[PDB]
Amino acid sequence: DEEESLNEVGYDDIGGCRKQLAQIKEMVELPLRHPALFKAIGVKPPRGILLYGPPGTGKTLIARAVANETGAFFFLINGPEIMSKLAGESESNLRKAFEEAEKNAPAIIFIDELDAIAPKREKTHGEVERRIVSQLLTLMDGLKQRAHVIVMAATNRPNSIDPALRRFGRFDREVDIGIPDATGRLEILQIHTKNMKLADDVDLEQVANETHGHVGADLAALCSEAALQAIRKKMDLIDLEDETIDAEVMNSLAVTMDDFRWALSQSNPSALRETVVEVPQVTWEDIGGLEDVKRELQELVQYPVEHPDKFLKFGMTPSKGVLFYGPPGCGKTLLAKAIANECQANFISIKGPELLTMWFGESEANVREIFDKARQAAPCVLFFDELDSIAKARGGNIGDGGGAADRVINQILTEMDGMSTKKNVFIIGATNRPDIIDPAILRPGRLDQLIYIPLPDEKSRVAILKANLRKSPVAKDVDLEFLAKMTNGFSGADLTEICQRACKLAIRESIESEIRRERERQTDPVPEIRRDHFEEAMRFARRSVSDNDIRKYEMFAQTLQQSRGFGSFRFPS
């Protein structure tokens, strides 16, 4: 019959959002269940909470969870529903809701979509809409701690509400429900697949890792498509689309890993173009050599965030960014990812094309938004890749006759020189052409530290080769040391290419052998990579960085070192 009471929304159904749920419990449940606790200290509880989030993230799920898991009186006001009523009656309904809730206590009020109730004031093309907004403002300011009434609201974007509603005494406290991470996606998948019958080879961890831009709605759609594929696969020739289906085939339904793979193939994530904010999965083991640079990075980033007392004692201002320079493809991004991972701080990457888009599009104001996002994810590491891309585009050594200043780097400087030092937002830049960079960047208070990343040596090449082969099942007979000794002027990318070519040759040989064996039988030869392949793949080896190109970097580093000629300073004593 009506067994919908078994299908409800509790705090267990909301997966991947634990911190936000904790905040909601803090500022929506405690104030109206223990009123005297805030009275004893003497602080006023908030009178309005707003919920951010891209579409399909779970904003309305929390509404139902709080509605049926609080015990206090709950009143629901749909956004579009209140606007569909005739003019004059909508105000009557809104006033009736706000008066009826106040009669009871506590009286949590949830407004689903107020972006359809109170849009931007200039965009309110009409007259009744402004009257509705004003009526909302008057009722909200009438809550003088009366019966402990708290108002909640949900929106797809903060920058669509009338700014008058984000003042003191109004919706001023906001939560930032966002894109789930890998663990969140795995938890959501485990929540959704709690009812259907899975097979014994379905590992949801692989599915969670493979999906990149999905949100809760997308994961639900993926599960539905997997179930549909499972139904269509075998029961289609048994099902007849008439009368009733046999109970035997009906009960005996399993969703295999192949169906999930097929469903994942036919998937369209709705958050691909968003900026990824997550802790990198790269550790110090993925990087070979560069031991000293790791120490310097740990000193620069980790010390000021762990021992503030020491810095306060000696009166020193911590550095606020570094600039890497060196030959291309040597690990200038792996270092940033690793240093972000070690300190457990979020990582936001801005690539060269991202900068070039703003220079062409005349939209450098977007730079501000970036520095807002990092400010919302402290502690965070902000990485700028190819800072010289704009300078390289403008002619290079011989430009259009202009100075060493452009539109986007200037905005970056303006925004960097105006951030509070209390926040922990480290800034890292990378450029393989350190001579055409804007000299204004290197001024103190900015990216003033210079670190040189050289080409790897023999031991470091051994380390790189060993690190990159943790996936390929190579036989224990090839001497990687000999390869490192022979390959002298190679960067990391070249060694990775050598490994990729060896793997490709092995795959091709295995496929050909399998096809020939099957053809012969119509009437695992190579389960691992052996020595000969690496020989053949060695013929297609080229040096990415020429021998006449490292002179620039070596001479630049030599001059920068030679400028420091006071190493013989000795006190008389």
């Binding site: 050594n397 011989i398 001579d435 006449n548 002179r551 620039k552 001479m555 030599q558 001059t559």
Partner: protein, 112 residues
């Protein structure tokens, strides 16, 4: 005293001259002999012509010519105290670096 590039008593180590003796140049004792390359300067209207000597093959690594110092000396000697002369430094650095390339390891024609 020694005038320039003479067969001194100091023994050449790995020099391509083959005489086994070091060579003297600009107050210093070198192994091989430098090349020569013409350079034109045109900053501030005035135009001057100069020759640059480049040292690339040597035993000790602290003796090989450094572009950022050669260009700085060339600019200072001919344009002392000129405002905003680093553009000329960058231009001459790029020119000498481009024209000093060693695509094939046989472009060794030291000046007598």
């Amino acid at each position: 005293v020694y005038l320039d590039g003479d067969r001194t008593n100091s023994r050449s180590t790995g020099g391509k001259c083959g005489c086994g003796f070091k060579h003297f140049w600009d107050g210093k004792e070198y192994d091989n002999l430098p090349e020569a390359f013409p350079i034109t300067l045109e900053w501030g209207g005035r135009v001057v012509r100069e020759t640059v000597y480049w040292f690339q093959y040597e035993s000790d690594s602290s003796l090989n010519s450094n572009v950022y110092d050669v260009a700085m000396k060339l600019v200072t000697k001919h344009f002392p105290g000129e405002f905003g002369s680093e553009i000329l430094v960058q231009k001459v650095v790029h020119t000498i670096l481009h024209q000093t390339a060693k695509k094939n390891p046989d472009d060794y024609t030291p000046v007598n």
